[PDB]
Amino acid sequence: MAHLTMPYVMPGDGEVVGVGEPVAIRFDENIADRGAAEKAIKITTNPPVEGAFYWLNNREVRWRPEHFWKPGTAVDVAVNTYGVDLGEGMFGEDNVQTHFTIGDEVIATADDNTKILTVRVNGEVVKSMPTSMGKDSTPTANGIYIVGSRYKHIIMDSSTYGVPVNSPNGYRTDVDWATQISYSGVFVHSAPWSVGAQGHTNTSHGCLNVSPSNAQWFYDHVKRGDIVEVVNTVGGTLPGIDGLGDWNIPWDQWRAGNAKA
Ligand code: NA
């Protein structure tokens, strides 16, 4: 009996995504030969751009260029793992493909010195939103965050992130208009309870609190792969292997890869 593993490729076939979206290939088993996996994945872009592979964990590899994508780029991915030994006799269960395109450049910068989140679309300021980020004891990390999933309404529960709800930094919070920007649990979301503090004082556990209307706007206009950059906070840097932290790894290190470690 064969040992098989199924690949899953993102983003979605035909999706339009932002300039920060990486190609993601996740397998349902640990990959013992990361080099075989990389060799089996073919990527074509138009206009052509150099890119490289980097593993976030034993099951998931990412591919991106050095710089954010050029708007209008079309990308084809073929994960040709059928017939490929991905290490220790674990074979690809199937081949998978995605074709996607890059939309407008959307980069929203949150500067702790001004407490404003400024959304720029192809270089042009379209919104200036007062924000309240993580208070000093639970700060928002600096760095480049890739926009992920969005929810009209959800609960953020700190136990998802290893912090008990009953503990001083714990929370179990209903939020409207929530756009996820890290797997570590940073979201841009509606925070009617911090509208006074927004633009002046950090009060959150690390999320970018903005007004109800600004969060709904963000929910409506920003898409997976668009960019939030956080600067000047008292936090550290979002980890490169967060899940949405890919761009915080310097290109030389990204390009060198981690196929053999
Ligand atoms: Na305010």
Residue numbers in the entry: 148 to 408
The authors write:
The transpeptidase LtdMt2 catalyzes the formation of the (3–3) cross-links characteristic of the peptidoglycan layer in the Mycobacterium tuberculosis cell wall. The structure analysis reveals that LdtMt2 folds into three domains: two domains in the N-terminal part, both of which show an immunoglobulin-related fold, and a C-­terminal transpeptidase domain. Combining the structures of the two fragments provides a view of the complete three-domain extramembrane part of LdtMt2 and shows that the protein extends at least 80–100 Å from the plasma membrane into the peptidoglycan layer and thus defines the maximal distance at which cross-links are formed by this enzyme. LdtMt2 (Rv2518c) has been reported to be expressed at the highest level and has been found to be essential for virulence.
